[PDB]
Design a binder for this molecule. Structure first.
Ligand SMILES: [Mg+2]
Ligand SMILES: [Zn+2]
Ligand SMILES: [Zn+2]
Lengths: 79, 50, 1334, 50
């Protein structure tokens, strides 16, 4: 569960970029391109995205690095 | 005031009524007009032959 | 998809380009079968097909074709949504004036031709003629005629003469005009000639002209030649159930226009006489003008009905137009509505919600999960499964609810806490359970009010409602830093019963090892809930850097305080629970817990407070009863004494000793005195009535009366209502506003007889009517305030300026009304502030001041702080975050992006429901006098010759405890800097006598004082000193009318006494009633009198609107020596003599009215020349922008703090910013603008900083304050100027200008339905702005 | 003072002023004005106090 979003505000500032980052992450987990990097407790992808923010292993920068890495693997998988 | 019915009444209120003989006089002017256009037809032979 | 919205005029070629048909016939549909008639107002070949992909005849019924048109009957076989889209046209036979460019108040054909509007309507109604460029023979261009004058001009000039009448004439006038020739002409008339008000009108007209030519418009497009028609599914004629139709009234309007156009074509075929076709052209003018905007004529009503019909501008403009009924606010799917109720078993991140509403709202989610889990093979099976409500769907619904926030909403959504998110817990029931602590945010009582739930569908909206709008985020108001989740009524009663102490109870004075055996003693019944007891508690504190230092001790406390101590988190000290804990104390408790431990312990602490408050209120049994209202034994005795005293005043009035008014005032004063004695009787009979015993005789304490706990805890009501229940209730006022001499000597515990209750009914009904009307006006005030200020968005991180205003405490005449601490807390410093020992930096230059910094301010002796304010920011098109402050639901600085204009205007207009001698020094300290210039008289006192003196009571800590506006010419006992005592009247002026005091000492004389004319000879009966005293204007004769009496001084030698220090004598001019007491050649001393001169909410909506005051304070323009000019015009010439500059300014003052300054003195710019209210225009134009924003915030904070409602000053300052965006430029220079042009301050600022960065000279401006209903329409974005106020003037003003709207500021983006460039959409607009044109 | 403000002098110009000031824009007529001021306050049909 997730009652307050305070820790995610302390990791990612500005309180509005948090929404966009968590939205992009939860779309990566709902549309099945990925799978969660934290144990889920039957939470929806919203709360799983916020918990992945609070563990520090997701922000905008890490998502950009991972997305460019997927694009490089597509370029290597063109054959 | 705008009230364009009243502007119509005031635009036609200047025209006065006719006597019972002035109508016959206007009708005779109408007769003179149709007389002159039929006499104008009367000189033109192509309408005749048409 | 697109960018900026453009608006302009419509050429007839443009209108033929839009339209896909000419509508030649007035039919609508065929009557027998309801196919549409070709080619009527509802057509096929003009607009579209009736059915989806089907011709009208039936030759083409399916998707075999989509491009074809049927050659039997024209149908372009497409979707029928196309019929919602394609438009038509009407070829008007004779041209027709457009009513919007004819009848709006700044009339465009009116001041485009420079012709008065009555003559234009006289031309358009065929009452007269007008020349249309008729050469130069005898008749000018705009020279109108009449019919007889037309026959005159035609028989006098047979040819080279042109003058039509009607719409053809106005169209020929607009077509004939060459614009830039008249542009050169008016530029020459504004260069050489000067006719001030007329040339101001002239420069307005040249502004219109060179705005028109800069656009792509032609003037003759203001006359309609081809009139466009609207698509059919916007004016639908659809079947109701029953064979009867609903038409829109636009069908009537277009039917009338098409009908009269066909009639006029039919008349011009038959060569009708002139009276008939002039009738028909007037009728077609009326039909078109009724179609475009009905109501600016004789209001052409509809058929079979007396009610006036609805035109196009009726559908755009107003409460029911598209701007306010279907664009700014839409009815929304995925919503519900039901009655709300309490359910105290909730944490505040969750609310109850019914199972039936949760099944109806979340239907597509349930459909999706059921077709995912394979219980329903198709989706129709899912429909029937959730229709039959089988037992498998409730587990599915519990899966789809679990972490999905809903939005709860109460209908008067004034401030932004009206919409909050929650997580639903499903309820066996039909009522939304709403958490109790949240309800004070809603202003929701549970007396039957019903709330609405909305559902965030998409994923981003779920994350918005959790991250921004969950209820645990909003525990601070946006109006101030106070908690809005304050415990309201049952919980504070449970606390106030729980933490108290009676002098004898079970377990009196025993010892306890901790809170745990306090709970074991109370819940076993050995010891009482409240008994004073030594316990051992362990409190933690944050002494080191974020470290929980533990200290343990035996505190002397009660049992119930120890039981509540388990609920306090680790960080707080014990002194937060050692007092009685009313409502103020528990609000301070939650505030300290939030400002120390952050958000999470405060949320779970608020939930635990609510639980323990309800539980021990249940254990309290706090119950009201009839014995709980003790009537004083001293009541009827005081009432009998007052009844004897009114008989005394009655006998004194029947004896003729007094008049009526002094009788009335004495009777109301003695009844108020009796009411005050009854109040001080009943309070001492309630609060200390409990007297019990412990190990001795007796002891008194605070009472365990039920109603005293319910008034002392602050749960419900205060001592006014307790007074009206126990003592006598007040003095009622009649409908005059007068107040009755016979008050209601009975409370509600006693009976009221019929007359007393009948008098009370008037006050009750006046109260109800005022609450209704003030609700309406507060709604209107909120709407104007948000619509002046949605454009402002925090956009930059920092501007880095040195500007700022000066925060000082607001003490005035009495004690402190708002201290320095809670004003500056939350703002930021402009420059560094220093200790009273100078060069001691206590804060650096720009740091966010939080509570430890205000602690550092209060431990020192600081009094005034320079603060960055949003009204003096530097940023283009917003306010930089480092200048705004911090105050929000969070405690940190404002984030980059968040809209503060909207939260500011809501936090101002939300408390709009709640709104409605000598120096007697109180406190002790040292005396200070600012702007003082005084002189010692002969009597050892001190008389004051400067009226800007401000009296400050400065204690040993430098701060100001009292201030007194010192009147001119007072009698100071002590001097300056001497330590004064309490009660000591230092200055004792005569408030009924304006002083004519001096600086000189010598023989008073008469100069230009002729007896009988300027002065009369009075011989006094009382004193006996006969004199020559100045008379009025009626009795002074024609010689001494303009000649004024003057007083002047000599010494013993006869030489003129000069002022010691200067060379000017004291020659002073006396008005009427200025009593000459001391005559010619009479000695005085320094400063003796040469003579004596004897005798709510619409305030806020006047301030922000900034209306001109009725009697303005007059103020000097430039600083200089004041002098008089000519006399007796009704006015006088007030002349200013600056020393360095050029003097020749004089201002007309209506000289009947009492002035302030004397002629011998000198004034500063912005100093007052008389008294009374002053316009904000004067304060802005003379003193400065900081002074006018200080004036607005101090006046409106007086209006709010009179009611006792806290609003932080950031909000009022940013509304002041949004007021003064426009500024007229004085010197044009290298810029493009004009000497009188009004352009916004941000646009001229980016122009100058491009020029001032170059070597050229800039453009100097004049800042100009505008009201909120005028600074919101004067905007560079016309949809925000057309969404709320006068619509027709805005659309025509932006249609003649070709104005382009770049969507700029949240009104247009709500209108056009895209993201908002404030909130989460700020990153999107920043990415797009980086992408756009780069 | 009211007489010094008033433009008219006699009965007929008074009735002409009222008939011009109730139905404005149209020229007046004596007997129509008389029947109008009959039908304002003194006719049994169009005016009634109970
Ligand atoms: Mg209610
Ligand atoms: Zn067909
Ligand atoms: Zn700033």
């Amino acid at each position: 569960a997730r009652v307050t979003v305070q820790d995610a505000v302390e990791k990612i500032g500005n309180r509005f970029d948090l929404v966009l980052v968590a939205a992009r992450r939860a779309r990566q987990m709902q549309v099945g391109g990925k799978d969660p990097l934290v144990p889920e407790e039957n939470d929806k992808t919203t709360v799983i995205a916020l918990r992945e923010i609070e563990e520090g292993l997701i922000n905008n920068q890490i998502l950009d690095v991972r997305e460019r890495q997927e694009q490089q693997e597509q370029e290597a998988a063109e054959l | 005031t705008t009230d364009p019915v009243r502007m119509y009444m005031r635009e036609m209120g200047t025209v006065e009524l006719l006597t019972r003989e002035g109508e016959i006089d206007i009708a005779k002017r109408i007769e003179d007009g149709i007389n002159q256009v039929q006499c104008s037809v009367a000189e033109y032979p192509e309408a005749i032959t048409y | 998809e697109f960018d900026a919205i453009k608006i302009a005029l419509a050429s007839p070629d443009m209108i033929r380009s839009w339209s896909f048909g000419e509508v030649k016939k007035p039919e609508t549909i065929n009557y027998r079968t309801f196919k549409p008639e070709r080619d009527g107002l509802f057509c096929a070949r003009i607009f579209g097909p009736v059915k989806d992909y089907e011709c009208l005849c039936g030759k083409y019924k399916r998707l075999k074709h989509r491009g074809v048109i049927c050659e039997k009957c024209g149908v372009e076989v497409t979707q029928t949504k196309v019929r919602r889209e394609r438009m038509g046209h009407i070829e008007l036979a004779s041209p027709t004036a457009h009513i919007w460019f004819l009848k709006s108040l700044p009339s465009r054909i009116g001041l485009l031709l420079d012709m008065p509007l009555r003559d234009i309507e006289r031309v358009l109604y065929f009452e007269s003629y007008v020349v249309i460029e008729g050469g130069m023979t005898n008749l000018e261009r705009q020279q109108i005629l009449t019919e007889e004058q037309y026959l005159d001009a035609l028989e006098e000039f047979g040819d080279e003469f042109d003058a039509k009448m009607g719409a053809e004439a106005i169209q020929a006038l607009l077509k004939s005009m060459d614009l830039e020739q008249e542009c050169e002409q008016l530029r020459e008339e504004l260069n050489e000639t000067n006719s001030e008000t007329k040339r101001k009108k002239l420069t307005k007209r040249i502004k219109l002209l060179e705005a028109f030519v800069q656009s792509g418009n032609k003037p003759e497009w203001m006359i309609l030649t081809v009139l466009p028609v609207l698509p059919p599914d916007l004016r639908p004629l659809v079947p109701l159930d029953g064979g009867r139709f609903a038409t829109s009234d636009l069908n009537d309007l277009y039917r009338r226009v098409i009908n009269r156009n066909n009639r006029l074509k039919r008349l011009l075929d038959l060569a009708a006489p002139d009276i008939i076709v002039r009738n028909e052209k007037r009728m077609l003018q009326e039909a078109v003008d009724a179609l475009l905007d009905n109501g600016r004529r004789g209001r052409a009503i509809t058929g079979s009905n007396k009610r006036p019909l609805k035109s196009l501008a009726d559908m755009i403009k107003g409460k029911q137009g598209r701007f306010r009924q279907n664009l700014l606010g839409k009815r929304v799917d995925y919503s519900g509505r039901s009655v709300i109720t309490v359910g105290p078993y909730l944490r505040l991140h969750q609310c109850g919600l019914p199972k039936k509403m949760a099944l109806e709202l979340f239907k597509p989610f349930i459909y999706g999960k059921l077709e995912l889990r394979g219980l329903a093979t198709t989706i129709k099976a899912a429909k029937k499964m959730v229709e039959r409500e089988e037992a498998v769907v409730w587990d599915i619904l519990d899966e789809v609810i679990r972490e999905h926030p809903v939005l709860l909403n109460r209908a008067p959504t004034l401030h932004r806490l009206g919409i909050q998110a929650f997580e639903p817990v499903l309820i066996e029931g039909k009522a939304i359970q709403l958490h109790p602590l949240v309800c004070a945010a809603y202003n929701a009582d549970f007396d039957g009010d019903q709330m609405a739930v909305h559902v965030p569908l998409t994923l981003e909206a779920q994350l918005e409602a959790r991250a921004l709008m969950m209820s645990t985020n909003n525990i601070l108001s946006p109006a101030n830093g106070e908690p809005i989740i304050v415990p309201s009524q049952d919980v504070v009663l449970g606390l106030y019963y729980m933490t108290r102490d009676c002098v004898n109870a079970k377990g009196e004075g025993m010892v306890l090892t901790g809170p745990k055996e306090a709970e074991r003693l109370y819940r076993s019944g050995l010891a009482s809930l409240h008994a004073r007891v030594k316990v051992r508690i362990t409190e933690y504190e944050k002494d080191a850097n974020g470290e929980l230092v533990a200290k343990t001790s035996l505190k002397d406390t009660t049992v119930g305080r120890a039981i509540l101590w388990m609920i306090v988190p680790k960080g707080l000290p014990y002194s937060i629970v050692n007092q009685a804990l009313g409502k103020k104390a528990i609000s301070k408790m939650l505030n300290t817990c939030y400002r120390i431990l952050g958000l999470k312990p405060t949320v779970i602490f608020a939930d635990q407070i609510m639980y323990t408050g309800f539980a021990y209120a249940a254990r309290s049994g706090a119950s009201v009863g009839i014995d709980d209202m003790v009537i004083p034994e001293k009541k009827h005795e005081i009432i009998s004494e007052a009844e004897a005293e009114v008989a005394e005043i009655q006998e004194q009035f029947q004896s003729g000793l007094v008049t009526a008014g002094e009788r009335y005032n004495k009777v109301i004063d003695i009844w108020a005195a009796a009411n005050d004695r009854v109040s001080k009787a009943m309070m001492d009979n309630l609060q200390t009535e409990t007297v019990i015993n412990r190990d001795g005789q007796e002891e008194k304490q605070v009472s365990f009366n039920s109603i005293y706990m319910m008034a002392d805890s602050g749960a419900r009501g205060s001592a006014a209502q307790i007074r009206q229940l126990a003592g006598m209730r007040g003095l009622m006022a009649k409908p005059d506003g007068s107040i009755i001499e016979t008050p209601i000597t009975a409370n509600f515990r006693e009976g009221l007889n019929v007359l007393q209750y009948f008098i009370s009914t008037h006050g009750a009904r006046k109260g109800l009517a005022d609450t209704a009307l003030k609700t309406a006006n507060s709604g209107y005030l909120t709407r104007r305030l948000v619509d002046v200020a949605q454009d402002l968005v925090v956009t930059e991180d920092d501007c880095g300026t040195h500007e700022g205003i000066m925060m000082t405490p607001v003490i005035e005449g009495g004690d402190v009304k708002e201290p320095l601490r809670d004003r500056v807390l939350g703002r930021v410093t402009a420059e560094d502030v220093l200790k009273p020992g100078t060069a001691d930096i206590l804060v650096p230059r720009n740091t966010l001041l939080h509570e430890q910094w205000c602690d550092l301010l209060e431990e020192n002796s600081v009094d005034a702080v320079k603060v960055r304010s949003v009204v003096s920011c530097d940023t283009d098109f917003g306010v930089c975050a480092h200048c705004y402050g911090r105050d929000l639901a969070r405690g940190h600085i404002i984030n980059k992006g968040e809209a503060i204009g909207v939260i500011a205007a809501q936090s101002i207009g939300e408390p709009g429901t709640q709104l409605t001698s000598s120096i007697q020094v109180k406190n002790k300290g040292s005396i200070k006098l600012s702007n003082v210039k005084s002189v010692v008289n002969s009597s050892g006192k001190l008389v004051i010759t400067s009226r800007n003196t401000e009296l400050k009571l400065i204690d040993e800590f430098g701060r100001t405890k009292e201030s007194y506006k010192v009147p001119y010419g007072a009698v100071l006992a002590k001097g300056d800097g001497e330590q004064v005592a309490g009660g000591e009247t230092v200055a004792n002026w005569d408030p009924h006598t304006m002083p004519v005091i001096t600086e000189v000492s010598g023989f008073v004389r008469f100069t230009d004082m002729i007896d009988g004319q300027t002065i009369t000879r009075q011989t006094d009966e009382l004193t006996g000193l006969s004199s020559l005293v100045v008379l009025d204007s009626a009795e002074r004769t024609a010689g001494g009318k303009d000649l004024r009496p003057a007083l002047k001084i000599v010494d013993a030698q006869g030489n003129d006494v000069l002022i010691p220090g200067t060379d000017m004598p004291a020659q002073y001019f006396l008005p009427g009633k200025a009593i000459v007491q001391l005559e010619d050649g009479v000695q005085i001393s320094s400063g003796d009198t040469l003579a004596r001169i004897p005798q709510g909410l619409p305030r806020v909506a006047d301030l922000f609107e900034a209306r001109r005051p009725k009697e303005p304070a007059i103020l000097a323009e430039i600083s200089g020596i004041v002098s008089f000019g000519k006399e007796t015009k009704g006015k006088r010439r007030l002349v200013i003599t600056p020393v360095d500059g050029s003097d020749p300014y004089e201002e007309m003052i209506p000289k009947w009215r009492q002035l302030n300054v004397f002629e011998g003195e000198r004034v500063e710019r912005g100093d007052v020349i008389s008294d009374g209210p002053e316009a904000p225009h004067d304060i802005l134009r003379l003193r400065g922008v900081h002074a006018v924003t200080r004036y607005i915030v101090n006046e409106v904070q007086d209006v709010y703090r009179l009611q006792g409602v806290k609003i932080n000053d950031k909000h009022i300052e940013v509304i002041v910013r949004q007021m003064l965006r426009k500024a007229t430029i004085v010197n044009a220079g290298s810029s493009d603008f004009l000497e009188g042009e009004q352009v916004e301050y941000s646009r001229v600022k980016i122009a100058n900083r491009e020029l001032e960065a170059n070597g050229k000279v800039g453009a100097t401006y004049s800042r100009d304050l505008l009201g909120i209903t005028k600074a919101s329409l004067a905007t560079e974005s016309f949809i925000s100027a057309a969404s709320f106020q006068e619509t027709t003037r805005v659309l025509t003003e932006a249609a003649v200008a070709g104005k382009r709207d770049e969507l700029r500021g949240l009104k247009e983006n709500v209108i056009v339905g895209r993201l908002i460039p404030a909130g989460t959409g700020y990153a999107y607009h920043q990415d797009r702005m980086r992408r756009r044109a780069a | 003072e009211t007489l010094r403000v008033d433009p008219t002098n006699d009965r007929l110009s008074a009735l002409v002023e009222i008939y011009r000031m109730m139905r404005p824009g149209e020229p007046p007529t004596r007997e129509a004005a008389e029947s109008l001021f009959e039908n304002l306050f003194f006719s049994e049909d169009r005016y009634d106090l109970s």
